[PDB]
Amino acid sequence: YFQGGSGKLSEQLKHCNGILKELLSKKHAAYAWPFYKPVDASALGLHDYHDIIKHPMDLSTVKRKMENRDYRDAQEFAADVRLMFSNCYKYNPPDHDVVAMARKLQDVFEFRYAKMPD
Amino acid sequence: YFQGGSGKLSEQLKHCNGILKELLSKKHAAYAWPFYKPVDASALGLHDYHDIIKHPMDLSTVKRKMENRDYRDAQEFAADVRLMFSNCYKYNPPDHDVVAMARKLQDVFEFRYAKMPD
Numbered sequence A, B: 001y002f003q004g005g006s007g008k009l010s011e012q013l014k015h016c017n018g019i020l021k022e023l024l025s026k027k028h029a030a031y032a033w034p035f036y037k038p039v040d041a042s043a044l045g046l047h048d049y050h051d052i053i054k055h056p057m058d059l060s061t062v063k064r065k066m067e068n069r070d071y072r073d074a075q076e077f078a079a080d081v082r083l084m085f086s087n088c089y090k091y092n093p094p095d096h097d098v099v100a101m102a103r104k105l106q107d108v109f110e111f112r113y114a115k116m117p118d
């Protein structure tokens, strides 16, 4: 209900915003879709999720934070994206399909984040 | 020449120290060894390395920083380990052997880092 953030993004944050658009794009939808919204622990029957995962994260939350101008630098953006993957790796056994998807999405993220303009 | 850091590690930093020890252990030496010391750009003939990579990182530097009590929290430790991998992904073509090694080492890192006590 207070004013939302707005302003130009820094050069490094434009790079991050580009990454975000790519992670949300049709290019990666086959493996990105489980990360499009918060994990709905109630609907999926994951009654231990919120006991194991203290800081839930997903791409819709990253998108709202970018649009709101919450991120002040690239490191802060990267930390949220990585948190989203870490949560998946913490909660799930390593042979789960959703873990395979997370690893693929993370390869996309890591390879492009590494090309940060200096 | 001034005093080195010393002090107890927080619980989360003990977890990070444990990860560090594992990354330096014989368990992972077949793919960790290129990260044991800074990239010696002179010796390897990589005369563009320091133009592309602004913040070099390697496991010996992470080790000295942990021993010196440089890291104040787990996120700071993770940022350096991840930076080491990112540098590798930035500099090298994605089919290079050293990239394959980096990905394997990063999988070891990410899966264990995700089990952060909290």
Ligand SMILES: CCS(=O)(=O)Nc1ccc(Oc2ccc(F)cc2F)c(-c2cn(C)c(=O)c3cc(-c4cnc[nH]4)oc23)c1
Binding pocket: A033, A034, A035, A036, A037, A038, A039, A040, A041, A044, A046, A087, A088, A091, A092, A097, A098
């Ligand atoms: C769009 C978010 S949502 O509204 O909560 N819907 C949703 C739907 C399916 C999910 O998981 C799967 C994805 C692909 C797959 F092959 C199997 C899944 F269980 C998941 C899912 C996402 N993540 C990030 C997870 O870590 C887990 C774990 C589980 C899970 C379901 N049953 C056991 N574990 O489901 C998800 C989520």
Ligand SMILES: CCS(=O)(=O)Nc1ccc(Oc2ccc(F)cc2F)c(-c2cn(C)c(=O)c3cc(-c4cnc[nH]4)oc23)c1
Binding pocket: B033, B034, B035, B036, B037, B038, B039, B040, B041, B044, B046, B087, B088, B091, B092, B097, B098
């Ligand atoms: C222990 C650090 S060191 O003293 O500088 N020695 C060292 C030795 C070999 C290295 O790279 C390779 C490792 C395995 C392999 F199969 C091929 C390599 F080129 C590398 C190496 C490490 N990293 C992190 C890199 O990104 C690259 C890139 C290259 C490289 C060499 N020739 C073209 N690219 O070598 C390294 C380093």
Ligand SMILES: [K+]
Binding pocket: A075, A078, A079, A082, B075, B078, B079, B082
């Ligand atoms: K990070």
